[PDB]
UniProtKB/Swiss-Prot annotation:
This is Protease 3C. Residues 2-180 form the Peptidase C3 domain. The lineage of its organism: Viruses, Riboviria, Orthornavirae, Pisuviricota, Pisoniviricetes. It is found in: Host cytoplasm. The active site is at 41 (for protease 3c activity), 72 (for protease 3c activity), 148 (for protease 3c activity). Major viral protease that mediates proteolytic processing of the polyprotein. Cleaves host EIF5B, contributing to host translation shutoff. Also cleaves host PABPC1, contributing to host translation shutoff. Binds and inhibits host IFIH1/MDA5, thereby inhibiting the type-I IFN production and the establishment of the antiviral state. Cleaves host MAP3K7/TAK1, resulting in inhibition of TRAF6-triggered NF-kappa-B induction. Cleaves host TICAM1; this interaction allows the virus to disrupt host TLR3 signaling. Cleaves host IRF7, resulting in inhibition of type-I IFN production. Interacts with host IFIH1/MDA5; this interaction inhibits host IFIH1. It catalyses: Selective cleavage of Gln-|-Gly bond in the poliovirus polyprotein. In other picornavirus reactions Glu may be substituted for Gln, and Ser or Thr for Gly. It comes from Human enterovirus D68.
Length: 182
C-alpha cells in the first residue's frame, strides 16, 4: 500500500524460502550465497525441506552472544543450486529502536502476509519459552502461531526475524551486519 510494504515485498519476493523441519513450516530469510537464517526453535537437522525440495544442510550454527546467552538465530548453509541476492547492506550495524516496521510471512498456511506492527523497541532481555534470550525487539501487535521466521523490515533496513509473542506483543531476534561477515 505504501513505502514500508514496498520494501517488505521486495525482500519477500527474492530473499525468502519456505523451510520445513520436524517442528513445522517457517519463513526463512536468505541473506547471501547459500546462507539463510531461521529461529533456533526450528531444530534444523542434517536434512531440511526448502520450497518442498529435500535439501542437505552443509552447516548450521545456533548463535549466542559473548555473555554465552541464546540469540534464537540459527545460521544455515544450504546445499542449493542457486544463490540468494546479497542483502547484507540492508542489515543494521548496531542494536537500535525503530519506527514504522512491517512483519512479512510466507508459508503454505499464510502466503503473501504483511503486518504493519508499528514502533519497535530495543527490549533486550526476554525469557523466551523458558530460555534467557538477548537482543530482542518488541512490537505491540498480537502475533500468532505460523508467523515465526517472519521478516521485520523498515523502509531501507532488514532488522529482525519473528521468534515469539505473549498474545498482546510480538518479539523478534535482531539481525546484525556482523553475523554475516564473509
Amino acid at each position: 500500500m505504501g513505502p514500508g510494504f514496498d520494501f517488505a515485498q521486495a525482500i519477500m519476493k527474492k530473499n525468502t524460502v519456505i523451510a520445513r523441519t520436524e517442528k513445522g513450516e517457517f519463513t526463512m530469510l536468505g541473506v547471501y550465497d547459500r546462507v539463510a537464517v531461521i529461529p533456533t526453535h526450528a531444530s534444523v537437522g542434517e536434512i531440511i525441506y526448502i520450497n518442498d525440495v529435500e535439501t542437505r544442510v552443509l552447516d548450521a550454527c545456533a548463535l549466542r552472544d559473548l555473555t554465552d546467552t541464546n540469540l534464537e538465530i540459527t545460521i544455515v548453509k544450504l546445499d542449493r543450486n542457486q544463490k540468494f541476492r546479497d542483502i547484507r547492506h540492508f542489515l543494521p550495524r548496531c542494536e537500535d529502536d525503530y519506527n514504522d516496521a512491517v512483519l512479512s510471512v510466507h508459508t503454505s498456511k499464510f502466503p503473501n502476509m504483511y503486518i504493519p506492527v508499528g514502533q519497535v523497541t530495543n527490549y533486550g532481555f526476554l525469557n523466551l519459552g523458558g530460555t534467557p534470550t538477548h537482543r530482542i525487539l518488541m512490537y505491540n501487535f498480537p502475533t500468532r502461531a505460523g508467523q515465526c521466521g517472519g521478516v521485520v523490515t523498515t523502509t531501507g533496513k532488514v532488522i529482525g526475524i519473528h521468534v515469539g509473542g505473549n498474545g498482546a506483543q510480538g518479539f523478534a531476534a535482531m539481525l546484525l551486519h556482523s553475523y554475516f561477515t564473509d
